[PDB]
Design a binder for these strands. Sequence first.
RNA 1: GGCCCGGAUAGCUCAGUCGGUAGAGCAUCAGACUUUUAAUCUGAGGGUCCAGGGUUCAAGUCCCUGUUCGGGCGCCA
RNA 2: GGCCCGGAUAGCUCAGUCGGUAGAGCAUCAGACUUUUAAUCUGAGGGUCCAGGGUUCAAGUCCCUGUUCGGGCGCCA
Lengths: 371, 371, 283, 283
Amino acid sequence: HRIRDGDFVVLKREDVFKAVQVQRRKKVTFEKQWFYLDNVIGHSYGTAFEVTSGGSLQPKKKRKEAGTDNRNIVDDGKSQKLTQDDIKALKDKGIKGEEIVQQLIENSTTFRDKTEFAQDKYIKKKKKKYEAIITVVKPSTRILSIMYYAREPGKINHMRYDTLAQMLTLGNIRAGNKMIVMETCAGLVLGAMMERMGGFGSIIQLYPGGGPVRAATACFGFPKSFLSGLYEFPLNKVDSLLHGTFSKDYIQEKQRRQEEQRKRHLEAAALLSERNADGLIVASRFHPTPLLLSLLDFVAPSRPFVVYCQYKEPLLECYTKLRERGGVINLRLSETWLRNYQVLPDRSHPKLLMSGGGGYLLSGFTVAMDN
Amino acid sequence: HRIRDGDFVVLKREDVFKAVQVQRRKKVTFEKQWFYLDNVIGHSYGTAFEVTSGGSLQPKKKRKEAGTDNRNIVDDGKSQKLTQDDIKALKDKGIKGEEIVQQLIENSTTFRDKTEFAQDKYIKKKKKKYEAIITVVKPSTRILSIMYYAREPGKINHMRYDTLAQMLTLGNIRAGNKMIVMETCAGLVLGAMMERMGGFGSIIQLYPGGGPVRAATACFGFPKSFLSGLYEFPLNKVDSLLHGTFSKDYIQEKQRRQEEQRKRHLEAAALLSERNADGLIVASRFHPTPLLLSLLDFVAPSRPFVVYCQYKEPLLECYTKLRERGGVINLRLSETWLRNYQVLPDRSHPKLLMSGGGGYLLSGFTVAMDN
Amino acid sequence: MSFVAYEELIKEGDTAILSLGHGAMVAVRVQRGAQTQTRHGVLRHSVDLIGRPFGSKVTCGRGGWVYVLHPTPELWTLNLPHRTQILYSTDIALITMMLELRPGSVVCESGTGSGSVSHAIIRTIAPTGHLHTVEFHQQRAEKAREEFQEHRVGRWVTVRTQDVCRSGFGVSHVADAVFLDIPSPWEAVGHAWDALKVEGGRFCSFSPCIEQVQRTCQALAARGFSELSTLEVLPQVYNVRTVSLPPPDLGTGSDTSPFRSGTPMKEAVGHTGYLTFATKTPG
Amino acid sequence: MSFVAYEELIKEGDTAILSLGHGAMVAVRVQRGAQTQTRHGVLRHSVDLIGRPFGSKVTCGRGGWVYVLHPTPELWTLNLPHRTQILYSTDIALITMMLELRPGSVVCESGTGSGSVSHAIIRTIAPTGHLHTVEFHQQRAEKAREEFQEHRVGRWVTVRTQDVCRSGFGVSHVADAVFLDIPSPWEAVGHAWDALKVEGGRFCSFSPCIEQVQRTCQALAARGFSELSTLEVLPQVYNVRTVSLPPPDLGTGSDTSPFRSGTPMKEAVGHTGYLTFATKTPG
RNA sequence: GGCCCGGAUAGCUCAGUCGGUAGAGCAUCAGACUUUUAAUCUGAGGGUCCAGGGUUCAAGUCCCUGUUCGGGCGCCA
RNA sequence: GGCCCGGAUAGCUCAGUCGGUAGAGCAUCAGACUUUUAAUCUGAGGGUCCAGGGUUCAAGUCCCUGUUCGGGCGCCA
Ligand SMILES: Nc1ncnc2c1ncn2[C@@H]1O[C@H](CSCC[C@H](N)C(=O)O)[C@@H](O)[C@H]1O
Ligand SMILES: Nc1ncnc2c1ncn2[C@@H]1O[C@H](CSCC[C@H](N)C(=O)O)[C@@H](O)[C@H]1O
Ligand code: NA
Ligand code: NA
């Protein structure tokens, strides 16, 4: 609803995002600056901000002759009539920023001779550097998936956000499902699944190493209620399961977690043994082929599965292997290309075409085996 | 300049192309019709035409209430007040076509209630079927490359026209060069190279089987003067060359060709032996890797080469192998995506994004070997 | 069925999806006494379908066989009767995530069209959310209501037959998200704002033509919408084939071995439409 | 050199391209007594370059080395001094073929800019063709003339310093092709028609923004141009790497083998501009 | 009796239950070859999707009818 | 004396002559483990590119200066 202390949150400046948890009297950095989040409270999500003295102040939500050609515009280097030393003074003096802009404009001999568009562009370039405006928004799969692909793409195996969206849809992720996921994407996929399940149903997370990564998952700010249906089970004990051959003051706290974890793992293994899961989602740094061939056995017939891979070649093998094994139908190897656009009056065009580094997907439905 | 008998030519209707040679009293088909080309002469290239009685007639170069919504438009199936039998009558009667349109409009109850755009669209659909207009244009790499990719893409290994263009540029094809080409693209690549060389320099074509394919090449309508610099040499005798170990009334005509071909082949082998070629172009149905590793030996240092392949994987190996062999620099594995646009008032958007089936290119420059 | 919950067994009234080989498929309404003909033979519902579990191989007639799949919006989208051009699952996936749709979401939509997006939304916002959709074509509106009842999702959706650009969505300040798929969405931007909660929400419009996008963006800005983004998403699908390029004959008597490739099914990927997103916040 | 003919040996006045490893490169004007510094050491022209053949490995200083490449428009495009944004070889390749450029072609161009396209055209239309290019910025115009003389291609090109939209290209009814790279090309469509031969020819305009394209297409149609086509070409470049995805630990004690992949150098391919083509015919 | 389902592009004729329809064969032509009213092998040329109407947004993976080829059900819709 | 060339993103510090800069290391933290003012192994968190100006079309693979790290040339520009 409205912002509050302890709330997990995402900061946005232009298209740049960074997630943080709000704490009274705590220092965090964002794009070359230092904040104290105390001042951002009681304000609605979508609120804007500016830095001042280490503290953020609530700013408003909102806030002509020109040439035709550049035929006589020359790059003398002597167009701005104030120095690289003068310039620091204005900041060292801690003036607003909007005035630093107005000053730079006024001291530009060429500005008036520039085209209206060239002018608009000159200003936008200056504002972006001197008028640092920070927005505070609510965490969501949209925002967190876009943040991660831009800020830490290696942590999520370069899974682009449009690709993540396809996985959620192709896997028919929804409330009530019993879902199996195997992710090394910092818990982003897990969290996205959890958002779309809304606390209804169950998720069984297979993890490598000593535990599941859920750094991203935490950024979502989920209720405790969503944890009751969340299970985890070590990936190294999967083979045993498909064969049935599966089994001073903190030392106690360590005994508590180890047994309460043992417990939660036994429950999880029971649920898996039922082999009646409503879907399978795989997105990891590991080779997918063996993961699928094993994990599908936990999935019920007429259920969707989706496998992500940063590379295509591994999914080609997995396609062929699933075709030998059988038990699947409507196999589809896919990729999505994403293009974003600048839409301005008389200045409309595409910016970037994201392709090849957004990843690949292999999807299909389970079916009953021949016997 | 202007159209004449014997001229190689390309026919165009909408975006559909077909190449043919003009002959007096000769029957050819084009998109469900029969022509006699006799009538198309003395006319300038770019001229338009219509069929009538098996003959083409020169036509001119050139030649309002509506609704807002379709909320009350229903698909009764009873909107056109003339029958599927009535319709043949108009054609069986051999009427113009424009009137068949005007009639269809007049007998459409819904037309007046349609949007202006929906109307424009309705007409365009009808004109395209009843107002068959044929343009006659001059052969060029542009037109022939677009024709082949649309009409016979398998004949040219699915090399899209933008990809062909890149090859010509990356290989710095120009007048004066001594070029080596190995093509199974019906002679399209050969012809494109010949257009850009303008009769200056030399081309040595390595062919498989009993001879080089030049069906497409013939569509260009090149002067005899371009043949003097054109050489051919069998691909099966290449290994011998790099080792120096290379050697009732028509029966005579067969002896003439066989010796005059033997001759032309000896010249070609001499030119190759000089190992001073200005570039190498490869586009075939054969695996490229061995072709390159052999053929580059005929190429001089500081010269560009370009290899086409419908598939990427083969070029990955070739990249690695060239890297072992050495003698190359600035290796570049590339692909081009092509997008075309509909540009109309209030109706502007992309149509198709051509990708993956246009092919791949491996390019670089030769350099001197270490010794 | 249902569309909103997986069930083990096929029952009467269920919409079942038959896979006919390749990727071809057909949707079927299961009724006692009913028959369905396919290229692999005949299916008699009362004995071949009803009572049987989804995902099973169903023998048809002369030894022919078929697989029967549980319905989903994605499968429905590929088998539903077109009364309009529809959105496919690639655009729908992006729309759903960027609108931040989830269980409990209240969503406004126009136009309903053939219900492809409608079903996806319902699947996503159930069991606590609701969809207020709008269609100014009486027949399409009613056909949509019929399907929603047949598929047993009427609880989560209300169809209103009216012009969204004059009369709005039929609700005010209740929606977390608004989705537009109409020819003149800039004339509905005000109503979208009115439909969205005062606390704020998300907006998305689908337009084939860039001039429609330009007008939409202009209207969004003027009304107070923020975080404007215009995107296009393009699906590419690959066939998995083994290919072998024959070695050339150089006259000589390993580096020419067969390989797996992922080749595009089509040489060209088409354009559906641009997707323009925005955010509503107080201030 | 020359730009229009391959020569075996490096000589004074030649523009040589040095490859510095990776894909990095630098262009150099070869002069006696001159020195060039690179990350691999120093090159003394009079002894390390002059007299030596292109394609050779040149030892520099402390045992460092470089390769020296013969100039081409493509290499020049990647090493020339920007006085403007320029077109790269992918757009130039398409422009060249679609304009039907060949030896003997007469071509009109505006604006000259930094001469990237100019050099490509000259390479293509030599030895019999000619380029009439136009640039209304005095300094850019003169810098272009200087380069053309330095590269010994002045014979094939004439630079005229004037406004193409008011005064045209400086010639009339002589051109087989017209190429526009300016902000307001719709104001030059009439002059393009006047510049092209009466017998006809080809037209191409490069514009970053779709609104510029729309105006251009409108003007082309009104003036009598035909065969209007608007295209965009997008280059994708791949790095060839061997990758190995580690097998997962399922607890078990072949299908996880390393592989060659072609991965994009960049996760996104940018937009340069739209290319609008058309044809002029009498009638 | 009818109903249901699937096809139609090259001169002709075909094309897979893996999400297998720009892939082929026949025939024709050329080269090579020997066995010559000619055979054989290799290769090449040949492709824009049956016709008509309706309709979707200003993007058809839409619909109806006609012709024709095929599969299935049974006197029921 | 100067000139030329190349670098600067994570708290810190690095990154290849194949067209090798979202790739890492250090440190920190967690898990496991034993040797516990703690070690070891494994894993995790941490990224938007030094600062300022100019300029290209309404797309920078553009330029100048400052700070600082490094390579090279020689008293020449
Ligand atoms: N002003 C308006 N008010 C309500 N509906 C409208 C409208 N303008 C157009 N429409 C309806 O919007 C629909 C667009 S087709 C939309 C299809 C839909 N997205 C799907 O996936 O199924 C049409 O059915 C049309 O009747
Ligand atoms: N009306 C006009 N007449 C002549 N030149 C113009 C012009 N309008 C813009 N220009 C020039 O056109 C150029 C566009 S930059 C073009 C770069 C060029 N295509 C290249 O590859 O190098 C600018 O230098 C500008 O000065
Ligand atoms: Na046929
Ligand atoms: Na640093």
